[PDB]
């Protein structure tokens, strides 16, 4: 919490960029910390078709390391830097822990059952295929078909690097902000 | 402390007196480094204070390393995007140490600047803190009234029949039930009034000896209706025990008890000792009109709110009654034909005179008694006139705030409609872009990514 | 004077008329030296006035050599660190001569700027001086209520038993004494009421001839308790003489006297002349409830405050009573069976009608009398209705300010807790530095010097 | 919406979680152009705000 401590010192934001984020961050939460209830207010504004509260709850837990209860600007930026301008390795572990709801690191088709459901839930019911009750399960079933060999952290890391299509989509936002 | 920091040379000068009576260990003075005023441009209006002024409170935004986020380097000034006429009171804190509340500024914006700059409402000066809390209370009550959760079938009929019981103005069955309950209460009380009055001989027989065969049927029908509606209310109350503990259920139980109590009493033997008591208790179905009329609820709320004032009313009334009854008894005792036989006998005269009622059957007949009777009348006026305005004022305030929260709910529904309209407009704006601003281009890319991560597309 | 200084050429022009009728002594004109506007930057907001405007009042901060302390040389401007929107009214003084009070600014900050710049509250203009004092009174009352010294054993038991007597809500013995005194007062007054009423023959004998053997014992026990508690109060009053002169001690002695007075009279001979008077005085133990209940104290305070209005009430009441009694007597004198034998006999009817009481035993029976009786009733309503609201308004204001002072004391204890917390935090901060800011480094050196001049060390 | 516009990098950071469970079609990021505060002199009293602050309510 200095401005120079979170400078280009394993944080991928410049001095001017850190100033811009803090001005916008403190605008919504003047206290310097944003909580889960406010965390869902901004996220739901970007996606008005449905509700993003279900996905923001899982997103907040990934941001809120150590389950403190509120995420501070010091560790709010380092999550953005890893996700936006971070390396390949740092992005995958962050996303792996986003799906890994529990403490130990393991995905059992049920922890991320709500993760994929949240992505489909945050669209409302207005889509052309009119969605379905079992369409999130089909997405999960095909998702496991490409990394789940027998029944982990190592499997997730090597599977994404194997196919370049997801690789060129992870780095989508590093060029523009 | 750090607040008195310009007096450090004074404190260091005072320390010179210790040296003659000390044992100098070379206390190693810190040997500090060595003060131009800095600019705090809060959205156009530049504010200039010395840096040492801000540093004397190193736990807020202005005195900290936190303001390095708001430093604008090429202009050599700190640019904040906050209110220019509320940051004025922020700087006045760093000079004196006490915050001042502006009487002309909204308290929801004043608290926003205090939270932004790190100040707290606990350090505002005592000169204006009584007003700050009073204006904070009104804002707090505005939040509570707006967030009372008045919204009103995924589960059984209990909830959807309780919403009808709680709100009889909605639906079509709730209104019918409300009207039929009101009609039954009215016909029951009117039937009691009629059966009390004589209707028509050996004697002037009332309407309860030759008649009152069908009156008993009407009374038992009304009691049965009250019991069944109470049971239906019970079958839809999530707080069944707490609902019973509520005042309305207590009133309902008191209203329905007398018929069953009388039937039980008359099953085995019969005496007139509890007959008149139960007949008196039968009229307690009047108080069941509290649900029907908001006026009764407001009156009950205003009596419960100022319960202490009613206690003082009773205490002072008893005090004056006892004093004046004693005075009149000992002043009008030796009269020829005097009805002031005792102090309890003078209680009737005292309470008649104090309320300025007057009957003329029991009056003083002595020069000493008349003066004290007039003084008693004036003192009764004085005593009764004290708590009357506060009861009426509280009743008026409660009624106004209850009819003010009515439009507060109306503005909430309109506000949610605007939010939904914006959500529909934002969704529709994306479709127009898909068919054919600065931030809108980037925001629509996020929705485009959401479409193509699930191979789905939003449509109209 | 110096206020009208721009009119000096006008005054010098007027002096030309003296020269024809004068005797020229060469009055030696001073031959002065010979005006650019100067900047007064009060924390960012620059204020520009001519130097001659400030110099016309050479006894304040702005017009003096005192502002040379606030001159900032490299910027060629005077920099003050004061309020920018309260200094606006400082400059308006140097132009016109009258200060203006802003209705939207705290008076504790307005007086701070006046004291800083040398102005005084005696020069503020008559246009806004009534409200300035009114807002000053509220601030002054806030200081007095906050500094009432409500804090509550290095000496004998007198002080520590008086603190229990004054405040019976604390400790455990004080509450017991309060409850037992209240119970004794209640049982005494109830016993008097019961012994007045008959209980049961030769005659309808009251409860004071066959009974009242144990009633005398109860009365003397209550009187003994009152006397001993008064003596205990006396044995703990630092203002013993002034405490006796207080209203509460007067009420206590008036309450306790009747028993001893009656015993003294009955020791030698016995007559009924003072028997009824002493029995009437015996009920004065009712007023001892003033200590127990705050309501009686508030009522006494509000009657004492508006004592002039009660005097006007009595004067107008007597005036109207005399006028209407005379009118009714001379208008209802020749009736066949008339109770209006005289104006003193008409006082009873007049005071009954004016208070809208009504008895019907003494009524007019003439066309002339009835009109004046109705006019008397209306005039009584008008006369009594005038001082009633002011008594109730003062009572409500006093009660609210007494509840207001309750939370005023609560915030004082909170501020002292924060002051002590800051003192503990400042002391703890030094220890953390010893185990392992700008001003904090120098301040901790002073404490280090204090350690080593007494060869002692602060520890946790 | 456009009111919360300074949180766009936060929303873009949140979108990274979709990529592992997505089927990347090259969603074609807009590739925007790239912020000095502007002056709003309302009759003598200059008011300074960033241009992005005003553009959030178009």
Author numbering:
A (entry chain L): 36 to 186, 191 to 216
B (entry chain G), C (entry chain A): 2 to 35, 40 to 157, 163 to 210, 215 to 450, 472 to 495
D (entry chain D): 2 to 35, 40 to 63
Please quote the authors directly.
Modulation of voltage-gated potassium (Kv) channels by auxiliary subunits is central to the physiological function of channels in the brain and heart. Native Kv4 tetrameric channels form macromolecular ternary complexes with two auxiliary β-subunits—intracellular Kv channel-interacting proteins (KChIPs) and transmembrane dipeptidyl peptidase-related proteins (DPPs)—to evoke rapidly activating and inactivating A-type currents, which prevent the backpropagation of action potentials. Here we report cryo-electron microscopy structures of the Kv4.2–DPP6S–KChIP1 dodecamer complex, the Kv4.2–KChIP1 and Kv4.2–DPP6S octamer complexes, and Kv4.2 alone. Thus, our data suggest that two distinct modes of modulation contribute in an additive manner to evoke A-type currents from the native Kv4 macromolecular complex.
The structures of Kv4.2–KChIP1 show that the Kv4.2 protomer comprises an N-terminal cytoplasmic domain with an N-terminal hydrophobic segment of approximately 40 residues in length (referred to as the inactivation ball), the T1 domain, a transmembrane domain with six transmembrane helices S1–S6, and the C-terminal cytoplasmic domain. The Kv4-specific topology of the T1 domain would facilitate the proper interaction between the intracellular S6 helix and KChIP1. The present structure of the full-length Kv4.2–KChIP1 complex reveals that the C terminus of Kv4.2 tightly interacts with both KChIP1 and the N terminus of Kv4.2. The C-terminal cytoplasmic S6 helix continuously extends from the transmembrane S6 helix and terminates at S450, which is localized at the bottom of the complex. First, one KChIP1 stabilizes the S6 conformation as well as the N terminus from the neighbouring subunit of Kv4.2. Third, previous functional studies have suggested that the T1–S1 linker of Kv4 dodecameric channels undergoes major conformational shifts tightly coupled to movements of the S6 tail, although we do not know what the T1 conformational change is. Together, these structural features mediated by KChIP1 may allow synchronized and accelerated S6 gating to enable fast CSI and recovery.
